[PDB]
């Protein structure tokens, strides 16, 4: 079996740090228990000739170890030493170095506050001293990344909570989100406006060498360009990062698969599932057996595909945005190797119901029967599957909160109450559908959503201080477009409602630099409030939330901004809980499901759980609540359909 890429083990670390060992300070040390796996395999079987390491014939000493059944490096396929293996290369504006001198040049650059691109297991990172305000500002400037939080690598996990240390030190070695109070060494520009920082430990030998020497936290963020697939070759990294890195610490061992760092919360909640988890399979729920080979294409954003067969499923790594130029290359390579590893040939392909998706174009090219699943149905089913809900387990009431997904009859959904089982999805109610003014711009400029909300629900909205910048603009042209339905489609979007509230509070830039920025800012603000007595509500009118009442109460409830933010989360949670309670109780349903990327909001989850203690509650945990989990949901629905003989 092939296991996921694994953090350097204690024994290899000990060996690398022992003067006199053949592998002393050798940056590519590995053994049967650790090192790259998926990222170095060209084809099955797992054997050196079909790995990236085929072009580095073993010296006699390595060969003896590789062939000795009692040795820790027995059949360690990518094993090497300084005499036979890959080596470091340093490149910086006409300067060049190799091996230990390459490492030392990179260290000198980091110490001096410069930015260096570093080759990792699954791509390249950009690094700098995370304490150094100037370096971090320069990185942000050069990368055109004014706000999005930066991952940091710490030399050790000392001082972090037990739960965080546990996760950090696993073979998966994920980025773990922790409260920034635990890491005071980090400059304020690491995660501005947020309450958490993503921290990670060195997990390959080169990272251990660097952190051992540097003894300080380092930014360790992905080395790519917005809109472009990440580099896995030296040549692409050199091209992509030329304006950004001051120098390049690279090497001649090929990476053949894109494999980003995984991201989890200290709580264990999975956000991004890549390095260290892929290509591990997962068991399907009770009742799923003898399932035909189904390829599930997942979603256009934060993509993963799924292979379903028999009684198991295997998810791909994070493959990013499918609309990005040239992203299909890494996607197809991932699919090639996954199919090879599992001897898998699909007989069916499942994809999203949105006819405009890139994935839905790709599906049309496969010469296989195709079928669709509604976006929000797949979110709900993915949560059911992770909780091992049996095939015949019965209906649940589901709350699916996100940005936008296509619902029934071409409606744009994003804040819905649904009656759900693996075969069926009935829409019951939710947020009212409100125009997205300027289409794609509405996710980029929170004020557009505040305008759309005000036009629908707020008498004399121009008179409120919250709406001042919108009021001062010639907003009437946009209001005319909205009335005429010109690039202003209606969407019942929970993400856009967050943005409207963030716009009203002023807690985000007028134009965002990354998706979800306003929502995360609003949550971070609300989280600093420990709870408050407040009059804000979202009453139920028929099967929808009454946002006219909400805005009237919220706009007229003056309080510190953190309390206003908290009141919004609390009112939204109470309103959705009342809708779900009515729908479930009158259907004899005792279990509620929650999914969609908005459910990554910890405060909203906490308030929902507070209001719904009279039900069994299922929240996502080992798979992302957002689009990274979508393909699993598609897979279980397709399987359930097939098992019913549909
Ligand atoms: N402080 C943080 N809060 C939330 N997410 C974070 C944080 N730091 C890193 N991340 C995660 O990292 C991913 C961002 O990708 P990228 O732009 O490559 O940044 P990086 O490589 O620094 O993680 C997101 O999925 C996000 O979940
Ligand atoms: N902390 C948060 N609070 C509220 N909403 C959030 C938060 N984090 C992300 N979101 C929203 O969830 C969306 C991602 O949801 P997801 O289901 O992954 O994608 P999609 O909208 O494409 O279906 C983000 O674009 C943003 O709208
Ligand atoms: Mg500390
Ligand atoms: Zn090892
Ligand atoms: Zn050797
Ligand atoms: Zn979604």
Which ligand is nearest to the Cα of residue 73, counting in written order?
4
Cβ atoms of 305 and 641 closer than 8 Å: no
- Does residue 191 line the site of ligand 1, with CB under 6 A? yes
C-alpha 222/C-alpha 573 separation (Å) is 35
Testing ligand 1's pocket by substitution, the residue of 178, 190, 263 carrying the most ligand atoms inside 8 A of its CB is: 263
Distance 201 CA to ligand 3 centre (A): 14
Residues counted in the chain: 646
Q: Which two tokens stand for residue 384?
A: 């059911």
Class of residue 49 by CB neighbours under 10 A (exposed 0-12, middle 13-18, buried 19+): exposed
Distance 31 CA to ligand 4 centre (A): 4
Structure-solving method:
X-ray
Q: How far is CA 50 from CA 1, 53, 317, 327, in A?
A: 15, 8, 21, 25
Cβ atoms of 429 and 399 closer than 8 Å: no
- Does residue 230 line the site of ligand 1, with CB under 6 A? no
C-alpha 403/C-alpha 496 separation (Å) is 7
SS3 377: helix
Cβ atoms of 427 and 642 closer than 8 Å: no
Residues with CB under 5 A from ligand 5 (ion): 59, 62, 81, 83-84
Class of residue 484 by CB neighbours under 10 A (exposed 0-12, middle 13-18, buried 19+): exposed
Q: Tell me 51's DSSP state.
A: B
Cβ atoms of 367 and 345 closer than 8 Å: no
Q: Which of 631, 540, 537, 525 is nearest to 582 (CA)?
A: 540
For residue 220, the ligand 1 atom closest to its alpha carbon is: 22
Q: What is the resolution of this structure in A?
A: 1.9
Ramachandran angles phi, psi of 232, nearest 5°: -120, -15
C-alpha 287/C-alpha 384 separation (Å) is 13
Nearest CA to ligand 1 atom 20: 221
Cβ atoms of 573 and 604 closer than 8 Å: yes
- Does residue 273 line the site of ligand 1, with CB under 6 A? no
DSSP 452-521: HHHHHH-TTGGGSGGGHHHHHS-THHHHHHHHTTSS--EEEEHHHHHHHHHHHHT-S-SS-SSTTHHHHH
C-alpha 401/C-alpha 66 separation (Å) is 52
Domains parsed from the chain with CATH numbers: 1-151+202-255 (3.90.870.30), 152-201+256-272 (3.30.110.120), 273-374+625-643 (3.30.420.360), 375-624 (3.30.420.40)
Q: Tell me 302's DSSP state.
A: S
- Does residue 149 line the site of ligand 1, with CB under 6 A? yes
């Amino acid at each position: 079996q092939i296991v996921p890429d694994a953090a350097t083990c204690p024994a290899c670390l000990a060996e690398m740090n022992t003067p006199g060992e053949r592998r002393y300070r050798y940056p590519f040390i590995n053994c049967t228990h650790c090192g790259p796996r998926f990222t170095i395999i060209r084809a099955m079987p797992y054997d050196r000739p079909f790995t990236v390491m085929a072009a580095f014939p073993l010296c006699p000493a390595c060969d003896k170890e590789y062939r000795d059944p009692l040795d820790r490096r027995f059949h360690a396929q990518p094993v090497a030493c300084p005499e036979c293996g890959p080596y470091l290369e340093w490149v910086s504006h006409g300067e060049h170095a190799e091996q230990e001198a390459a490492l030392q040049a990179a260290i000198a650059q980091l110490k001096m506050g410069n930015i260096v691109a570093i080759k990792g297991i699954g791509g390249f990172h950009l690094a700098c001293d995370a304490r150094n305000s100037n370096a971090v500002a320069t990185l942000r400037a050069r990368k055109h990344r004014p706000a999005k939080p930066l991952a940091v690598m710490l030399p050790v996990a000392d001082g972090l909570p037990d739960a965080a240390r546990q996760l950090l030190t696993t073979p998966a070695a994920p980025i773990v989100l922790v409260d920034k109070k635990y890491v005071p060494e980090l400059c304020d520009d690491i995660a501005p406006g947020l309450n958490e920082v993503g921290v990670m430990l060195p997990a390959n030998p080169l990272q251990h060498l660097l952190l051992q020497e540097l003894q300080c936290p380092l930014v360790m963020t992905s080395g790519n360009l917005s809109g472009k697939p990440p580099a896995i070759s030296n040549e692409q990294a050199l091209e992509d990062l030329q304006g950004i890195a001051d120098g390049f610490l690279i090497h001649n061992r090929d990476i053949v698969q894109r494999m980003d760092d995984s991201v989890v919360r200290e709580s264990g909640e999975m956000l991004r599932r890549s390095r260290g988890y892929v290509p591990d399979a997962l068991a399907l729920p009770p009742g799923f057996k003898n399932v035909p080979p189904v390829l599930c294409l997942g979603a256009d954003l934060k993509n993963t595909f799924c292979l379903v067969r028999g009684e198991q499923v295997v998810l791909s790594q994070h493959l990013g945005d499918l609309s990005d130029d040239g992203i299909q290359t890494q996607w197809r390579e991932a699919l090639r190797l996954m199919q090879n590893i599992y001897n898998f040939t699909p007989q069916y392909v499942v994809h999203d119901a949105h006819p405009g998706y890139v994935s839905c174009q790709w599906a049309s090219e496969m010469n296989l029967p195709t079928q669709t699943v509604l976006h929000h149905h797949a979110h709900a089913a993915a949560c059911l599957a992770e909780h091992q809900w049996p095939l015949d387990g019965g209906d649940v009431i589901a709350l699916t909160l996100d940005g936008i997904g296509m619902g029934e009859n071409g409606a744009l959904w994003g804040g819905e109450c649904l009656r759900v089982n693996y075969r069926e999805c009935e829409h019951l109610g939710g947020l009212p559908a409100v125009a997205l003014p300027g289409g794609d711009l509405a996710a980029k400029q929170p004020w557009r959503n505040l305008l759309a909300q005000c036009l629908r629900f707020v008498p004399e909205w121009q008179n409120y201080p919250e709406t001042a910048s919108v009021a001062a603009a010639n907003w009437s042209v946009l209001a005319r477009a909205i009335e005429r339905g010109i690039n202003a489609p209606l969407a019942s979007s929970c993400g856009r409602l967050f943005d409207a509230v963030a716009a009203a509070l002023g807690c985000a830039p007028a134009t965002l630099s990354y998706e979800g920025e306003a929502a995360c800012a609003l949550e971070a603000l609300a989280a600093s409030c420990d709870g408050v007595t407040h009059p804000v509500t979202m009453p139920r009118v028929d099967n929808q939330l009454d946002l006219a009442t909400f805005w009237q109460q919220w706009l007229n409830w003056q309080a510190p901004v953190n309390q206003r933010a908290w009141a919004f989360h609390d009112a939204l949670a109470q309103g959705f809980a009342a809708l779900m309670r009515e729908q479930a109780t009158m259907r004899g349903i005792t279990t509620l499901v929650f999914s969609g990327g908005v459910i990554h909001n910890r405060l909203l989850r906490a308030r929902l759980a507070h209001y719904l203690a009279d039900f069994t509650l299922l929240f996502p945990q080992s798979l992302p609540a957002g689009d990274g989990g979508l393909s699993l949901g598609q897979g279980v629905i397709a399987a359930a359909r097939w098992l019913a003989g549909e």
